[PDB]
């Protein structure tokens, strides 16, 4: 929880001088990071899900929630049950430990010029960055992982519109 003060700097040094808020409480604040991996249809991947639940613990050190299906949609082989997801909601200091790690190692290892977007919002203050798994295990290299994959990181804040969530993402973010 060292670089949490980066936010406590920017609440009063930039955000009180940008929109001119009338109180320190209603500055836009980030509440959760969910790192929902996606579906990965497990007609066979139920064993790769045991790898996919092992890879996501290495990214963020919390066990995923293996989210199951809800409907019985045809042209797709799944029922109620059939665990076809994984997510970790990152609430506390593990957010900032993940955030102040990832935004320095996301643009370099992706080998993209700009890198993420100029806009990805939903008009409310939520970003939903998309990852093709080119960043993870920065510590143990490409030795024992098996199958290439793709993550998804959602940033849920207390921003109100798009331009206030651009301000929080202008703190060591690259739009």
């Amino acid at each position: 929880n060292r670089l949490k003060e980066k936010f406590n700097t920017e609440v009063t040094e930039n955000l009180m001088k940008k929109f001119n808020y009338s109180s320190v409480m209603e500055v836009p604040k980030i509440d959760k990071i969910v790192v929902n991996m996606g579906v990965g249809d497990a007609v066979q991947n139920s064993k790769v899900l045991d790898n996919a639940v092992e890879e996501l613990e290495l990214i963020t050190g919390q066990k995923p929630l293996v989210t199951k299906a809800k409907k019985s949609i045809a042209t797709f082989r799944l029922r109620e049950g059939m665990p076809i997801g994984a997510k970790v909601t990152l609430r506390g200091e593990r957010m900032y430990e993940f955030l102040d790690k990832l935004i320095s190692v996301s643009l370099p290892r992706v080998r993209d010029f700009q890198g993420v977007s100029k806009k990805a919002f939903d008009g409310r203050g939520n970003y939903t960055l998309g990852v093709k798994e080119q960043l993870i295990f920065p510590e143990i290299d490409y030795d024992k992982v098996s199958k290439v994959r793709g993550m998804d990181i959602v940033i849920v804040t207390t921003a109100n519109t798009d331009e206030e969530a651009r301000e929080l993402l202008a703190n060591f973010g690259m739009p």
Binding site: R2, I59, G61, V105, L107, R109, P138, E139
Partner: protein, 59 residues
């Protein structure tokens, strides 16, 4: 907070030769050799990276 289901993580001091942006963590349970006191007093096992040496955007 639950015991049993979590993997290991620690204050991984990202020992990079360009300004040492040590605000990272993970599963680098390796040899602890030099721990900076301003940073995470743990393993420096992040030995080299392209994290904050030359950004493509802020070049």
């Amino acid at each position: 907070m639950k015991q049993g289901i979590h993997p290991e993580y620690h204050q991984v001091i990202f020992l990079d030769t360009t300004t040492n942006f040590k605000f990272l963590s993970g599963s680098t349970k390796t040899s602890s050799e030099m721990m900076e006191w301003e940073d995470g007093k743990e393993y420096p096992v992040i030995r080299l990276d392209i994290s904050s040496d030359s950004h493509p955007f802020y070049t």
